[PDB]
Amino acid sequence: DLKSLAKRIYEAYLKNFNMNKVKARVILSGNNPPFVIHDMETLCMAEKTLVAKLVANGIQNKEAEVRIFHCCQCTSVETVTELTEFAKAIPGFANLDLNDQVTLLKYGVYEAIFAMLSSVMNKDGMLVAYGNGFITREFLKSLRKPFCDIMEPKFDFAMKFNALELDDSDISLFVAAIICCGDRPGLLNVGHIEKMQEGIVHVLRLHLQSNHPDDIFLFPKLLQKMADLRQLVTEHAQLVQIIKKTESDAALHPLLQEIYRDMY
Ligand SMILES: Cc1cccc(Nc2cc(Cl)nc(SCC(=O)O)n2)c1C
Ligand SMILES: Cc1cccc(Nc2cc(Cl)nc(SCC(=O)O)n2)c1C
Predict the structure, then answer these.
(1) Is residue 103 in contact with ligand 2, taking CB distance under 6 Å?
(2) What induces it?
(3) Which ligand sits closest to the CA of 256?
């Protein structure tokens, strides 16, 4: 029945995220292949195909950094939506207080985002636009400050995360564990969430034992990546606040505004 819990989480994962690791690595290996975005010329081409209403609105008059930022925001909104439904399908979660649900998701969504973002990254770039764009690490490094600092720390995390060779069945449990975290600020009923977390991590521990018998400390490694992600998000939010207050035209979508409000 612990395999029940694992298979349920995994199936809710396969069902709620449009992009999964199996699908992503196919696209990242080589009908409707991804348009490679590596300079301004290819960015403009890709935009004319994938966001024609925006181009018609004149977005290509804006700095490339602003369009990339708003592309990033749009993807974050979509993934928050998917993560919210995934969480809703985690055994015990929807039994939690409605206030604590919002708290767990508020603090957890970006840790889960950057964990799953590794699935669509390789050492040269990341998939965007539902698999129909591949924007290169170097083009993103090439942007003006502060925008060139957005993505490279996520690439750094992802290269070491992907070195662990986790599959979607591992990742789904990792993300569940990320979300069911008993030490978030603001939690009403911490004891239930800890009992929920304990149950998820126990399943994760058993699953890694079965699925990766060759990596002796993989479970402790993953706990450390959880700490690494929380520090990554803290730093990300500070760079995002710098851009919000400093960069005109880089306004914050309201769903994301509310996530960052009173976070760190
Ligand atoms: C890599 C990629 C793929 C598809 C489109 C775009 N450009 C975008 C994407 C989005 Cl969601 N938004 C914008 S500009 C938004 C605005 O200035 O109101 N520009 C980019 C930068
Ligand atoms: C799944 C995926 C792929 C590519 C980009 C994004 N969203 C990101 C990623 C990164 Cl490293 N940075 C941002 S800045 C805007 C925000 O804080 O949502 N947004 C996401 C969530």
Answers:
(1) no
(2) Down-regulated by aging.
(3) 2
Q: How many structural domains does the chain have?
A: 1
The experimental method is: X-ray
Alpha helices by DSSP H, listed for 149-217, are 152-162, 168-179, 190-211
Give the resolution to one decimal, in Å. Answer: 2.1
Q: Which amino acid is at 159?
A: M
Give nearest CA residue, ligand 2 atom 14: 72
Boundaries of domain holding 259? 1-264
Question: β-strand 35-37 against 133-136: which pairing, if any?
Answer: parallel
Reported as type and span, the H/E element at residue 75 is: helix 64-88
Side-chain-side CA neighbours of 113 within 13 Å: the count stands at: 26
CA 133 to chain centre: 17
CA distance 114 to 232: 8
The answer to the question of whether 248 is labelled as a binding residue is: no
Atom of ligand 2 nearest to the CA of 237: 17
The Cα–Cα gap between 33 and 37 comes to 12
How far apart are alpha carbons 112 and 236 in whole angstroms? 13
Q: Report the DSSP beta bridge partners of residue 220.
A: none
Centre of ligand 1 from the C-alpha of residue 22, in Å: 26
3-state helix, strand, coil in the chain (%, to 5): 70, 5, 25
- Residue 232, H or E segment: helix 218-246
